[PDB]
Structures are given as C-alpha cells and as structure tokens.
Amino acid sequence: XTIVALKYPGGVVMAGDRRSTQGNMISGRDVRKVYITDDYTATGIAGTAAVAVEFARLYAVELEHYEKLEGVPLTFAGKINRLAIMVRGNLALALPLLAGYDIHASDPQSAGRIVSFDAAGGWNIEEEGYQAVGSGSLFAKSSMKKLYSQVTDGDSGLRVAVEALYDAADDDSATGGPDLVRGIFPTAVIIDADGAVDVPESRIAELARAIIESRS
Amino acid sequence: XTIVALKYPGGVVMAGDRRSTQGNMISGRDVRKVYITDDYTATGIAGTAAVAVEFARLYAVELEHYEKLEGVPLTFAGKINRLAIMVRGNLAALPLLAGYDIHASDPQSAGRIVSFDAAGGWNIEEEGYQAVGSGSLFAKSSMKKLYSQVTDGDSGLRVAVEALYDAADDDSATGGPDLVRGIFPTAVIIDADGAVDVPESRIAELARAIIESRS
Amino acid sequence: XTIVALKYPGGVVMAGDRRSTQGNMISGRDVRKVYITDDYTATGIAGTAAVAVEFARLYAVELEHYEKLEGVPLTFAGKINRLAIMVRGNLALALPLLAGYDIHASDPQSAGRIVSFDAAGGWNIEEEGYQAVGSGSLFAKSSMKKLYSQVTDGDSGLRVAVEALYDAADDDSATGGPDLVRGIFPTAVIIDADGAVDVPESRIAELARAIIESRS
Amino acid sequence: XTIVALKYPGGVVMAGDRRSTQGNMISGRDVRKVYITDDYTATGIAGTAAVAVEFARLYAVELEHYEKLEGVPLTFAGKINRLAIMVRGNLALALPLLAGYDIHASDPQSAGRIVSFDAAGGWNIEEEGYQAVGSGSLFAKSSMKKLYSQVTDGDSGLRVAVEALYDAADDDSATGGPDLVRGIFPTAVIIDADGAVDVPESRIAELARAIIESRSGADTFGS
Amino acid sequence: XTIVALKYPGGVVMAGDRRSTQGNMISGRDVRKVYITDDYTATGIAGTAAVAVEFARLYAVELEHYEKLEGVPLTFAGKINRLAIMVRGNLAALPLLAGYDIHASDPQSAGRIVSFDAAGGWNIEEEGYQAVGSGSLFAKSSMKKLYSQVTDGDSGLRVAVEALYDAADDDSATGGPDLVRGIFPTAVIIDADGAVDVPESRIAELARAIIESRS
Amino acid sequence: XTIVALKYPGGVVMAGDRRSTQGNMISGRDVRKVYITDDYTATGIAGTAAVAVEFARLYAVELEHYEKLEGVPLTFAGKINRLAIMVRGNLALALPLLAGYDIHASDPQSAGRIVSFDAAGGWNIEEEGYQAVGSGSLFAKSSMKKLYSQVTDGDSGLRVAVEALYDAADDDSATGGPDLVRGIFPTAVIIDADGAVDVPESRIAELARAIIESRS
Amino acid sequence: XTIVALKYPGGVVMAGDRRSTQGNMISGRDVRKVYITDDYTATGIAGTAAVAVEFARLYAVELEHYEKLEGVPLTFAGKINRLAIMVRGNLALALPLLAGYDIHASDPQSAGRIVSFDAAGGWNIEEEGYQAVGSGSLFAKSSMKKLYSQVTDGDSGLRVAVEALYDAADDDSATGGPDLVRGIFPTAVIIDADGAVDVPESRIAELARAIIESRS
Amino acid sequence: XTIVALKYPGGVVMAGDRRSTQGNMISGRDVRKVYITDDYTATGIAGTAAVAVEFARLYAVELEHYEKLEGVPLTFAGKINRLAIMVRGNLAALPLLAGYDIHASDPQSAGRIVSFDAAGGWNIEEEGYQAVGSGSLFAKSSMKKLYSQVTDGDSGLRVAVEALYDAADDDSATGGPDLVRGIFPTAVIIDADGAVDVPESRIAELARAIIESRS
Amino acid sequence: XTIVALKYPGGVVMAGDRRSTQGNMISGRDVRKVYITDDYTATGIAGTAAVAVEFARLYAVELEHYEKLEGVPLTFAGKINRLAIMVRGNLALALPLLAGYDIHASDPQSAGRIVSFDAAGGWNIEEEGYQAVGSGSLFAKSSMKKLYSQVTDGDSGLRVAVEALYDAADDDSATGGPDLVRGIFPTAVIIDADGAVDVPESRIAELARAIIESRS
DSSP states (O other), X not given: OEEEEEEETTEEEEEEOOOEEETTEEEESSOOOEEEEETTEEEEESSOHHHHHHHHHHHHHXXXXXXXXXXXXXXXXXXXXXXXXXXXXXXXXXXEEEEEEOTTOSOXXXXXXXEEEOTTSOEEEOOSSEEEEETTHHHHHHHHHHHGGGOOSHHHHHHHHHHHHHHHHHHBTTSOOOBTTTTBOOEEEEEETTEXXXXXXXXXXXXXXXXXXXXX | OEEEEEEETTEEEEEEOOOEEETTEEEESSOOOEEXXXXXXXXXXXXXXXXXXXXXXXXXXXXXXXXXXXXXXOXXXXXXXXXXXXXXXXXXXXXXXXXXXXXXXXXXXXXXXXXXXXXXXXXXXXXXXXXXXXXXXXXXXXHHHHGGGOOSHHHHHHHHHHHHHHHHHHBTTSOOOBTTTXXXXXXXXXXXXXXXXXXXXXXXXXXXXXXXXXX | OEEEEXXXXXXXXXXXXXXXXXXXXXXXXXXXXXXXXXXXXEEEESSOHHHHHHHHHHHXXXXXXXXXXXXXXXXXXXXXXXXXXXXXXXXXXXXXXXXEEOTTSSOSTTOEEEEEEOTTSOEEEOOSSEEEEETTHHHHHHHHHHHGGGOOSHXXXXXXXXXXXXXXXXXXXXXXXXXXXXXXXXXXXXXXXXXXXXXXXXXXXXXXXXXHHHHX | OEEEEEEETTEEEEEEOOOEEETTEEEESSOOOEEEEETTEEEEESSOHXXXXXXXXXXHHHHHHHHHHHSSOOOHHHHHHHHHHHHXXXXXXXXXXXXXXXXXXXXXXXXEEEEEEOTTSOEEEOOXXXXXXXXXXXXXXXXXXXXXXXXXXXXXXXXXXXXXXXXXXXXXXXXXXXBTTTTBOOEEEEEETTEEEEOOHHHHHHHHHHHHHHHHHHHHHHO | OEEEEEEETTEEEEEXXXXXXXXXXXXXXXXXXXXXXXXXXXXXXXXXXXXXXXXXXXXXXXXXHHHHHHSSOOOHHHHHHHHHHHHHHHHOOOEEEEEEOTTSSOGGGOEEEXXXXXXXXXXXXXXXXXXXXXXXXXXXXXXXXXGGGOOSHHHHHHHHHHHHHHHHHHBTTSOOOBTTTTBOOEEEEEETTEEEEOOHHHHHHHHHHXXXXXX | OEEEEEEETTEEXXXXXXXXXXXXXXXXXOOOOEEEEETTEEEEESSOHHHHHHHXXXXXXXXXXXXXXXXXXXXXXXXXXXXXXXXXXXXXXXXXXXXXXXXXXXXXXXXXXXXXXXXXXXXXXXXXXXXXXXXXXXXXXXXXXXXXXXXXXXXHHHHHHHHHHHHHHHHBTTSOOOBTTTTBOXXXXXXXXXXXXEOOHHHHHHHHHHHHHHHO | OEEEEEEETTEEEEEXXXXXXXXXXXXXXXXXXXXXXXXXXXXXXXXXXXXXXXXXXXXXXXXXXXXXXXXXXXXXXXXXXXXXXXXXXXXXXXXXXXXXXXXXXXXXGGOXXXXXXXXXXXXXXXXXXXXXXXXXXXXXHHHHHHHGGGOOSHHHHHHHHHXXXXXXXXHBTTSOOOBTTTTBOOEEEEEETTXXXXXXXXXXXXXXXXXXXXXX | XXXXXXXXXXXXXXXXXXXXXXXXXXXXXXXXXXXXXXXXXXXXXXXXXXXXXXXXXXXXXXXXXXXXXXXXXXXXXXXXXXXXXXXXHHHOOOEEEEEEOTTOSOGGGOEEEEEEOTTSOEEEOOSSEEEEETTHHHHHHHHHHHGGGOOSHHXXXXXXXXXXXXXXXXXXXXXXXXXXXXXXXXXXEEETTEEEEOOHHHHHHXXXXXXXXXX | OEEEEEEETTEEEEEEOOOEEETTEEEESSOOOEEEEETTXXXXXXXXXXXXXXXXXXXXXXXXXXXXXXXSOOOHHHHHHHHHHHHHHHOOOOOEEEEEEOTTOSOGGGOEEEEXXXXXXXXXXXXXXXXXXXXXXXXXXXXXXHHGGGOOSHHHHHHHHHHHHHHHHHHOTTSOOOBTTTTBOOEEEEEETTEEEEOOHHHHHHHHHHHHHHHO
C-alpha cells in the first residue's frame, strides 16, 4: 500500500490508496487510510483499515483533549511530539505520515508540513516538498520527483499526488490503482489556512481518469 | 499468476495471464505463458517468461524428436508420460497440458487436460476444467458457476477469459486486462484441425464485454 | 469450518456450518457457531463449539451490562468497539464475524452491517455486500460473488448464504455439507428492523434440498 | 484416503475411495487408487492418482516381464517378494495394499490373499480376513470387525467393503464418501479362480445408495 | 487408557478401563478412573490414578461448596461451567463428564455427556455416546455399530463394557478384563434416583458373556 | 515384543510372542518371529513379521549355500561368524537371538547354544543358561532366573520359556500374551541331537492355558 | 551499481555507472561495466570490474568461436541462448543485461534488442523500450518511465540513459554519479545498423553537465 | 554518517554531514546531527534526524533544569557525567560532545571533546580531534595530515569540513557537499563567548574551495 | 599487516611491513611479505611469512614456466590472468597485491602497474596511483591520498610508501612500525624499465628515521 503527501503554495495534500492484501490475496478494496485528525492535521498509515482508523482516532482524541484542558491547541511542534510519543509507545508494524498546516508560521505559502517516521520510531520533518510511505513509496517518490515542478496550486498538487499513487500501483501489486469498474478511487485530504477538508471522491475520479486517458 | 484450461464440445481451450512478480513488484506485463507444443497440444506454466518458454521448447523438441525417429506421433498417453518424465527430472513451477486426442472414439469429448501436483504426479482432469497458479482457486470457483454456459469454442474462450479476470480481481499476482497498454491474456484453442493461437483481437473484445458487464 | 454473512434489502443473514475436525478426523457434526448476541447482533466464529459459544456469551453479557448500567444500548459503533477490545484482549485462534442491524441508521434497507476481524485483531466494516471466515471462506466468497445479484430479499438472501456454505463444503473438507442421513444442516440468523431471529432448521433443510436437486 | 481389502469364500475384494486432498482442500473427486496388476492380483495405494497408477504400472510390467522371460508366472510368494523389493527400493509416502488369489493353494475357498506394508517397508500376510490402509483405515477396520461375520460370498464381500469405506468417510474428512450428486463412487476389484475383474460402477452405485437409505432409516429410528 | 460414556433411556452410564502405562510397561492394573462427583454427576479421566482421583475430589468439593453456600445445587449448565474453569486453569488429562439433569423437561433424555478438547473447550455430546483416551477411536467405532441395542440401563452398561473390550483389543494402552486376577472395568450409572457405582459382579458377568460370544 | 531362549540338558528351546505394535496400536496378533534356519539352528528377532522372516530366510540361504559348495556344514563357530557378518552389514533396528545345538561339541548335554547381539552388532555366547531380547526382555529374564532351577529336560525347559513370555506380556504391553479367544499362542522351536523342530501349537496352548489356570 | 539500456529509432544504447563498493566503502571509481561482445552486441553486469570484464570476455570468445567454426554468426536468438546457457552454468551473484541490434530483423527502426536475466537465470526480451539492472535499477526505470517519450534518435536516447543513471545515483548510494572533480563519467555503448561502438567520454561529459545544470 | 570535532587555539568546532541511509538507499539529504545543548556545549550523533535531535533536546533540558534548580550551571565534568548517565541508561547511536570549559585556567586550550565507546564509556580526547560514524576513520586520517594547519577558528572549521569531505569521498554512507541542491554540512563553533551555529554560507564557501582545489 | 604500492613517473614501488600476529600476540618481527616474481613484477600478501613466500614462489615458477616453454614472457594482461586463475583456485584467506611494469606499453612514464584482488577473487587494475591491502590499508590509503602529490620520482615515491606504512602502524596494532631497537624496517621493491630490484634496507632506514624526526 502507498500513502503520499506533498506541499504546494498555500498548503498540503495527502492521498492514500484503497488496497489491503493478505499475501498475494486482495483482502480489501475500500480501505480508508487517511484521516483528518484536527482542524489543521491529517494522518495516513500504510496498513490495515483498523490500524489507520484506530491510530487516527486516538491521536485526534489526544489533540482535542489538550485543547479542552488548556483552552488552546498545541503548537505544531507539540502535535508532532505527542504523535512521536504515541508511535514510540506502540513499538515498545506500519508508520504514520503526518500532513499539517502551521497556523502560526510566518510565511503562509509554505506553512504546509509533512512529518514522517522511520523504522525505529523517529520523526522527520520533510524539507524536499513531498514524501511517501508503504510498499509503493519508492515508485511514488520517483514519480513525484519528475512531476513536482508542475505543482503551482491546490488542484495541481492534487493531480500530482493522484498520479504518484497511480505510478505506485502500476509497479507495486500491493498498492491499489483506480478501480473504474467499481468506482473506487484513492482518498485525499487537503489542508490550507481555512483548515483540513476531505477531497470529494468525484474530484479524485476525474483526476484518475484524466491520467488514464493521458496514458492511453 | 494463473493458467486456466477448459473442455468444450469438439475441443479444448487454454489461457494465461501476462503478469510476473518479484515479491510485491510488477516485473512483467507481457509474459507469454501458454505455448503450442505440437499439432495437438499446448502447455502452460504459472511461472516466469523463461520457465514457460524453455519448458515448452524442450517438450516440443522431445515430441518432434519422437515423430521423426519413429515416423508417427506418440499416443496421447505417451505424450503425458514424456511430460511427466520431464517434470519429475526437473524437481530432482508445475505445467498444465491441454490436448486433443485425434484417436479417441468420441470427437466431441476428445479434449484433454492434464495437471501436475507438487510431488510431480500427473492428473487427467475429468470435471471439464482446471487452473494452476496463485489465482487458481478463484479461477476454478468462477468456472464452477460459469461452465454450464460452455456450448462451443467461442463461449469456451469467453469463460476462460472471465475465469482469468476473476483470478486477477482477487489475486494481486495475476494480471487483469490492461486497457491502457492493450495487453490481454493469451490463449490457445485445440480441436480436430489442430492447435491454433487465439488472435489478440477476440480476447480484447471478450475482455471488454466482461468489464462492461461487471461495470 | 466456514461462517458466511450477507446483506439483503432490509437486513442481514449469518450462517455457519456444523463440522469440527481434529486433523483429518471429524470430531463434531452439530457444532453451533452462530449465536444471537443482542436484539440486533449475532456473532459467528470459525472454531470449536466452545470458542464460538464462550465468545458469544461473554459478548452478550457485555452488551446487556452496558444497557442495564446506562439505560440505553450502545450505538453500533460502540458495539464494534467493545468487540474489538475483547478480540485484541484475547490475542494476548479464530476471528469473529459480526452481523448486525443498525436501528439508528438513516436508511433502513441498508442498515444491515457486517464486521470482520483480521489476523492482527483489526476490525473491518464490510462494504461489498458479503463476507466469509474460515477454511472454506475463499470458496464461499467466490460462490457469493456469482450469486449475489440474486439477493432481493431475506429468503433469497438465506438461500445464497446456504449455497455459499454448500460450495465451501464441496471444496473444503474441513467444512461440513448438509447431512441428509442425520438431518443436520447449517444454522442461521436473520436480522432486520424487528430484531434477530434464529432461522428454523426446516427452512434451511428445504433450501439445502433444492440446491442439491438443481446440482443433481 | 482409504483402501480396504477382504477375503470372502472363493476370493478377495479390494476397494478404494475417490478423494485426494491438498491440506484441507479437495483436489480430486475421481481418483482411481485400485488397479489390476495381473490375472490374479490388484494393488491399492492410499495416495495421489499418479502414485497409485505409477506403482501399479511398474508392478504389472514386472510381473508380465517375468512371465514372458520364464514362460510361467511367479508363484504368489514370488509376487510378494518382487513387490517388497520395489517398495523398499522406493524408500530411497504411501504404502501399497496387495490383493490376490493363489491359484496353486490347496483350498480354493480360502485362496484369497491380502498383503500389507508397514512404514519400514516390511510385508505382512493378513490372517484376520481383512485390512485397510490410509487415513480412514482405523475407522474402516473397526467397521469390518463388526460386519465381517456377514461376508459369505462376493456380493456380500463387496457390500461390506463399500460400507467400511463409507464408515471411513463418515469419520475421516480425507476419505471421500459416495457422491450422489455427481454419480461418483468407490472403485473395486474382485478376484477369484477365474481371475481379477473390475467391479461395475452400477453395483457399487446401488450398494452405496442402499447403505445411505439404511443409515438414514436407522437414524430416524434412533431419534 | 479409555473412558466411555453413553446415554440410555432414563439415564447415562460411564465406564473406564483399569490400566496405566509408563512407555510400554504396565504400571497399574487396578486404576480407578471414574468417580461420582455429586448425586447426579460423575467424571472420568484417561490418565493416572492420581490425576483421576485428584481432579474428581477437587470437582466434588467445588460442587458441594456451592450447595452449602447457596442452599441449592448449581444447574447442570453451572456444573459444566465450573468444570471448564477448572480444566482451563490446569492447562494454562481431558475429563469426560456424565450427568443427569434433574431439571430437564424430559426425564428419559435428561442424561448428559460433556467432553473437553485439547484447548480446554467443552462440548455437550448430542450423538448418544463419547469416549476419551488412547483407545477412544476404537471404542467409538464399536459403539457406532452397537448403540441401536441400547434400550435400558442394563443393555447400556453392556455396550459400554463391550466398547471398552474393543478398545483393549486394539489398543495396548487400554486394559481388557483380567479373568486371572478378577479385575474388571469400573462403571457408574446415573438416572433420576442419582449416581451409583455399578457392582463389580454385574460387570464380570457382562465381560464373561462378551468373551464367550467372541470365542 | 519378546524372544526368550534357554538351554536344557540335551538341547535348547527358543520361543517368541505374536504381537506387533505401531505406537500403542496393535497391528499384529499373528506375527511369527522364530524360524528354523538349518537342521541345528533357529533365529528369532523381536521385530516385525518381515524383519524376522527375511533375516531368517537370508541366513538359511547362506548356511545351505556353504553346505552345497563345500560338502559339509559350517562349524558352529562358522555359523555365528556368518550371522555376525550379516548383522554388522545391516547396520551399514532389532537384534537377532540365535539358538543352536553344536553337533561336534564333546558334551551333548551342554551342546545347546544361545548367541545374542548387542546394539553395536557384537555377538555374545550366553553362559548363564538363558537369554531374552525385546521390550519385555527384563521381565522375561527375571522370571527365568527364579524358574530356571526347574529346568531338567526339553519339556520343563519349554514350560519355563512359555512362562517367561507370559510374564513379559503381563508387564510389557508391547509383548502379546496367550489369546484364548482367538486360539493364538507363542511359537517355539526345540533343538537337540536329532535336530530342530517346530513345537506343535497344541503343546503351547496346553502350557499357556495351564499357566493361566494356575495363576487364577 | 546500475546498468541501463534503451531502444531508440534505429538502435539501442546501454550505459553503466563507475562505482564499486565493499559494504559502505567506495572501492572503485572507474569500474567499466559495459563491454562490446561482438559487432552487434554488448553486455553489462552490475557487479565488480572483474565480473563484468570476465563475463564479457568469455561471451565474446564464444560468439567468435561459433563464427570461425561455422562461417556465419549465430542468429540473435542463438546469441541469447548461448548467453543463457553461460548464465545458468555459473549459477550452479549478478545477472547480465544484453543490448543488441538484429541485422536480420525486417524493420530496422525497431531492430534494437534488450535482454535481461532474473534471479533464477531466466532470460527476458524486453518489450517496454528500456530496462535497468542493479541496486539503482528501480530509480533508473522510474526515471526512464517519465522521460522515454523524449527519445527520438541516438543522441536523445543517450541523454535519457545518462539521466536515468544520474537519477539512480541521486537515490542509491551504491551507484556512482558523474564525478566532475575527477572527470569520471558513466560509460556507454550505442548499437545500430553499422555496429556497436563505444560512446566517447566527451559526449557523455557534455550530457552529464547539462543534466546537472538543469537540476540546479 | 560522520560527525567530526576539533580543538583550535581558543575553542572547539564540531561539524556533521547531512545524509541518512536505509541499506543502500538515500533516505535523507538534510539531516541535522549537531545541536547546541547549552551556552558552552554541542552534541553530535551519527544516527537519524530523530535520534540526534531527541538526544540533544533531552540533554539540553537536563542542563538547564540543573541551572534553574541550583542557580549555577554544572561544571564541565558534571555535564559529561550527566551525559554518560544518559547514554548508559539508553543501552540498558553514540554521541560526540564538544564543549568549552569557562572555568579552565588556560583559555586557549579550554576546548573539550568527549567521545563514547560501544560499552557507553566516556573518553576525554587529548590528541586534538575526534570523529564518530561510518566515515570516522577516513575523517581522522584526513585530520591527522591537516591538523598542523589549525591556528584559529577559521582554519579549524576548514579542516572540519575537509575531513567530512574526505569521509564522504570514501564512505557512501556519509554525504558530501551537494552543490545542485545547495546542502552542506552543519557546524557549531564554541569559544569563550559561547556556542554559535556556523552560517551555511561560510560552510558552502569552504566546500566550494575544497572542490576547486581538488579539481 | 599492510602492503602498499604506488606509481611514480617511470615506475612503481611496492613496500610491506614485517609483523605477524596470532591474536593480540606478536609472533613475528621480520616477516618478508613482498617478493620479486619475475624481471618486471612483484607480489605482496598481507598474511603470514609462509603464505607470502609460497604464493610468490608458485607464481614465479608459473611465469618462468611459460617463458621457457614458449620462448617469450606472457604479456602483462596474461600475467594478471595467470595470477587471477591462481587466486580463484585457492579460494575454492589474504589477497595478492601485484606491482609491475609493462615494458610493451607505449608511454614508459605511466607503464607502472598495480593490480589488486577483492574478497571474491576478482582482479582490479588500479588507476588512482596507489593501493594498499591488509588490516592497515585504510590508514595507508588515506595517508597516501594526502601525500601523493609529492611523488615526482623514485625516491619521493619510496618515501611516500614508507610514510604510508608508518601511518598504518601508527593506527593499526597489527601492522609493524620501524623498529629502531632491532634495526628492522619495511621491505620494498622498485620496478622500472631496467627491471625489479630489492630496495636496500639502509635506504628505507634513512627515510624511516627522517619520518620519525619530522613527527617529533
């Protein structure tokens, strides 16, 4: 499976595929892996439907718990720290990709944030513009490398994220491509100054068919 | 990967997917797994391009070698025996053989399907269809519900394509019809007139109707 | 062993075979694996008689314990959460299949629910209409795939569930088929807006006879 | 899988189920495990279609090979010896059950012979009247133990062999019972003074349906 | 070793052999494996004299402990539950429980047989009989052919002794009736009037008759 | 299983049980383990029917082979030597017990011979009067120890041999006792100056039945 | 290390990096991995300098051996077969990538051939236009995937091959990038109707400098 | 990865590369491994971004915690001791501490370099320089030949950068200066006025100079 | 132990230390590891006295064997080939460092040759000017890297070789430094157009004393 995230001027986009496999067997076709965790963040886990929703749920509870207790949300660094504590506490096997928007950053155009976790449970702020986790991560990053220069805005950032997932699926049998027969497409979240919002299934569908039409 | 074979009145059909994998990665998209080995037989191996082509080439040479030396082809039972000897000598994947016995008393049921188990033992199929590979269970269960629709060569071919489609739908290691690249399963059809490669165009038309039908 | 569950307009049906084996030996012929756990839920486990009944008993006590303590039943999401907690706590073995009817969903015809658990103890709300667990699950699912379009009501839902179990037994020696000599047939639960009810053995018997007759 | 053999007055009968499994999966429903090997012998292997047929084929070639070379068949003891040599040489797995009729034995009524092979490849002449090999063999033997007193000729012999296989399937998921939907039933060979002959499917099909009808009536009476 | 239990009209009978082995050596000839655990139950363990007696003693203590505390005996389901809790607590040697439910609606079928699998799970036996131990498969296959003869307590007891005889005949770890030393299987019979130990004299007569009929 | 052999004034007797087991299961009730190998020797193996018969057959062939080639039988030392070569060659498993009568020994009363083989294939001429091999050997030897003083001829010798086998069965579940129901009893060979002869089943039945009545 | 090959209108190009490593240590900086094996073929091995030179030498001898003995070169299918026999004989390690031009093909524009070998020693005629082997193969292939539409002739074919190697080095520490300090660049062979020729270091040097300047 | 530290007259310099790898794959290009921990110390870890920052953060918290509680900073020996306790507690991957002891009598040599061995044992480096990581031997052998050129903070920083350059030139796991992306080693310089981060522009200039010199 | 080799304008020089160790213990102080193998070659092995001399002896016999049989020496490429064959034959241990002068090369100033062998037995022609093998090879190469620009002739080349060995011994306890108490110094061979000659111990001693004085 593959989760991708990328920064564009004004925000960040995270997209995840819909497959789950048990060996060579397809065990899921609608797995939702990316979830909004707070007004300005979203988590993506390249694992099972349960691992992805249970992690996001516990994390969202922790963020809101702080907000109610202290009257104000944690700073972006504090959100990463709580996440890192949660990830290290679970390893003592899949790791989170966090997308966020820092409402306190001085430059709004680059306030988008991508944070990844390595095998040992260590956090990493991504400074190259994009990142990907999971079995098709390399194919997705190599695809984004050649396409990232086309990212000038929210929509274009979303096309590139869908095209990276398409490339991941094209080369990794463990990542699910757009399913035109069943109408199932990658999920995605977009975060900017106005907050985190789920991208409509219809918008991703049009982007996925444009890619398919273009490659045909 | 998946190879299917089915019997239809007056013939047999064998079809194979086009994928190859190395762990989770797609290493091949146009792998040819089914090959005509003599006028009346075809072999299919649920493995790499090389194992499938090399096994068929050696088998084809052995069948033609006998015909030139003795002046007549081996009987169907002798073809299986040579195949079994070749498989057992290699274990010290597994092939699926489709054939047509020109000497059987009933032309309509002269189609033959022979599979091989893990220990290298042969098996003449009597239920009408067989499948080998990682998606064989899905293919077999699909053919179980569709076989009653096989009345001739064409509907046999359609069921073989749909069985492969179902194998791909549920097995990530088997490749479905690729409409973007125009790559489809390969197939061989054997009847009293001999073994012939099925044209890509017909497979593509059938694959399109199956997709449209499921959509 | 095989347990199947499928959604039909207005409800859900869960059915299980009656076999139990110890290696190649048939150790049981009347094993009941599906149990009603509350007015709107049923659980099925592809294991021994004791695992299936003990799990169902503990789960039924937990749902009623909540209802008596707080005066109202848990929501459907709460029922799954309690089930997930119980499953993850036992993994410290066969996975439960949950069938339910959410009396609080906005749409009554699609209010039927099917929840499965993976090897790691993770829950999954099934969205494709049916699901199966156990040694004959792949044969039952491939059978349901070809027969699902025939489900238009509870009776046609019941028949497809029995036929999926029949196909599971036909290809998997660990799943028991209908025993006409002893009069032993798969058990089944049907849940709709009026609650969960055990399907009478006689109707399963007639459905099994009709499947056998048409295959003959 | 289960193979059974039993002696009846004037002969012997050997019967085998039709299933093959790969773990819990049913891989075969038409497996033929019992084969005539010469005019007076048959072999049965509780294994795959190929092991059963390949072993029988090699054994039959060996018996006929001797007959063509020496002008006369091996004695019964010589057939067992050749068989044992072939089994011990393959232990370099399922063990065969051989059924035969010794045309040179003094008493024709008891001239039926059953020979089994243990894990170490050692032969055993059965002297209790019956034997079974395979995963359902204990269920088949315990069934024959209670039914053997009913064996008085070829037909009752065949019937008890079919019931023993039925009982093996009833308790062992790796042994296949009669399939009334597909019309598939156990195969059998019967050997007497006139030689070895394959039992027709029709009589085995009738006997299997009769066993099922009796069991079904007995079950209703019991409840 | 082998323990057998069977239901008969109006009750249930449980019987056990008397042997104990250490590898191939006979270490015991008068091992008592079946014990009355309360007025309506008995347990049998296919193990050593100590395991059989110690488990039965602890179970009987627990049943009477409840009765003295609460004033009434546990229901039959409760007795199974306590037994299962005791078995699972010992595994983290599989008992056969035979009983008579005085509260069941139909007295003729009120007999109960409960077994335990390797994982410690309970199973109410609905087929009429059950057996545990190294000779259990032989005893069950014998009862399968003889159960139609069970019409009352005496014929139930006869079938139970013959199933044990057949277990011994085929399993060297189960002891047959020893006519030289006068040692025979032990048995308990439970009906509406409660659990009673069957006198050695009736078992001896049955064994002698079984032996005579086989000679 | 058990094989016993004992010397009596004038000769030697060797007896064996009839059981064969596969774990705890009785696989044979009729196994013959003792065979006459030439006019003055017999072998017994506490193993399967095939091992016992096959060894004896090969040994008998070898002894007769020498006699035809050389015109005279091997001396007793030569017979033991050929046996040892055969045993050491098969260890390149159960061990044979040879019972013989040396027709050239000067004292005919003590001309009886018993030769055993240890785990490493080494031969041993027994000098204590008796020997036993197999799973019930210690029980048989300890029984012969207390009964040996009653051995004065072939008949009291045969009786002691049957009683030792009965004691072996009484304490070792792998050794078969006299089966009165089926009429199956231990086999026995007695060798003296007139050669080796199979003891009639009727003499063994009479001895076994008497040991039984006496202990009753 | 990485070797790449691609087909262009009228021929084929193969290029290899120059690094060799022993664990994390750089053990070589001028390793030549691609060699012309006959007038119309070249081999590349993603291994040490010795493995790449020795394999190429033996293969070249074998091809010329046939030509001197038979008077004519092997057909391209015969060249692949001899190669496969050599590879399978050594696997009883790194696998070769063959680049060739079939002078006997009917369409000259597409006569370029690329043959790869899998872990089991099996040959594969690449039909997708390009292939790569070694530790940076995946990065090189994902780069070529996006750049292949730019290959219209030999020069643009050579440029993409160099850019694919650059991309492999950029992401895989085991593959060597262009060393401007030492003046060491990837090597390359180009094969068309006029035969196999070593591409001059100067052309590869210009192509690598333009690639670097455009990434800057 | 490689971290280097060296003493110059009046202070100490510590520099780290920017790469991270997962086997042979480059996973990071901008990893920061060297952190100022207090007004007079810096730590460098030849590991991942996270291990480096987390270790430095915890150590910085512990130094400042002491200062607020006690009113005065720990002595340099006390800072080493707290670091050692922290390192030994994490083994029940190894840091390089650079510092300046404001309390030492001779200001010119008050720079301090402390390393940790595999067993968690501390070592005050008394030869002038040290390096940890996969390229450490190459870096130390380079500094051995260049150390005589260190007469001040600037020449000290230049030798630190050239040692890192040599580590990358011979170890694929250490990243060299990336002129395409404009990413260079990071560095901290500590003297009597405290620990300060070295501007990237200053490092980039040195790196270009080394590259121009070698070409 | 360490062996170093470097090319100077007009030839090549190879030098080796004199220590041998059995674990932490010094077992040898006068081990000669570098030997002249023919008029234009020398081999050095970072191993025991016997391995170094036995290898050199077998290799020297092979080169002279060819010369006597065919009348002319092998070409340089053929000498390497024979050496590689000998190395691969011994691996199916410490690896040979070969120093030589190709008297048939067009440019005599660069005719010096250095050939190393990797763990797998593969040969490598060194193009960077110097090479080293053994436990102190990395220290020697990093020292030569900084000092190589000083090599302008035979004498300065010899000084740099001795100073590389000095640096190896300074950082590696298994490599032996110059021993002033016993008068034992590294051995060395120098090869140019006039052939291979052993460097006199007195010249090495003066260079070693100058290096020691300079570091003091």
